Amino acid sequence: GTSKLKYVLQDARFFLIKSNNHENVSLAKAKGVWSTLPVNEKKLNLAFRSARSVILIFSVRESGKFQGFARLSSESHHGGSPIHWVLPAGMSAKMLGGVFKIDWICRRELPFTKSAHLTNPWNEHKPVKIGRDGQEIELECGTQLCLLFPPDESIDLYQVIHKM
Template identity: 40%
Template structure:
């Protein structure tokens, strides 16, 4: 009888450990963010194109971790920040024919966030500034992402434009956005020499 109780107790301990282990895995999955190494299990996220007048503004944003968009995008970005787990911004300098990196919003637009330096030079109103955390900062030419189609930006025939087509604030469908981030990350790794590691 004692042997039976011992086996039963051991079995319960194993089951308890198994449940605890998988509960932690589920919690980790739910806490997964786009700063993780892979995108295959990413939670709900929204992607947007950010257009910059020049590269200097992007360099300063990479250094300071703040940005401001056009005033008309304020409500859309605030709503996105509060309604999903990750808001990913795909940066592209006008006429550069490239993406210059991707960042995640870490705050909604707010007057309490320091204003980016470039805002002082503008002659039109912007959104309140917001904080961002960069995922990758290496440029990728449009030719490497042209095969990705943005389902949220159809042409006159109803066919989706390539992801590289879009004005400031253009939302990007999840598959295309994840594809751009994956390519940017791969190029980021190459720039750091990770591709040469055994």
């Protein structure tokens, strides 16, 4: 059911994550990590301290879809093992230096056409698919977006709930 999911999403904060390629989202799903540009890294570290849950909602650029969503389980940590990201043009491996641990809540896709009725107050009420990497999504919009995803029955939210 959706009861444990709703419990995880209670009073959460939501951020849109944009990836230039599928490879990095696949790597994030396999290894349970994400890295983003320094400006967004600061915002996520601030959010992680402030909310019961911080939810990253992933979308690969030009894919027309969201690829799933995950919960931060840590602040960014540097110096550690180097993740073999595929780097876009103008992206250096030092900009993606900070590494967040994440717990996936849903690894299923959602097409943008299915979220056309959801607008984001924190981005001028543009459709929620619209936003730069790191755009915050207001609570009610983010909650309804996450509830539109197909259920991912391979994930037990029981361990997720305990981290809180």
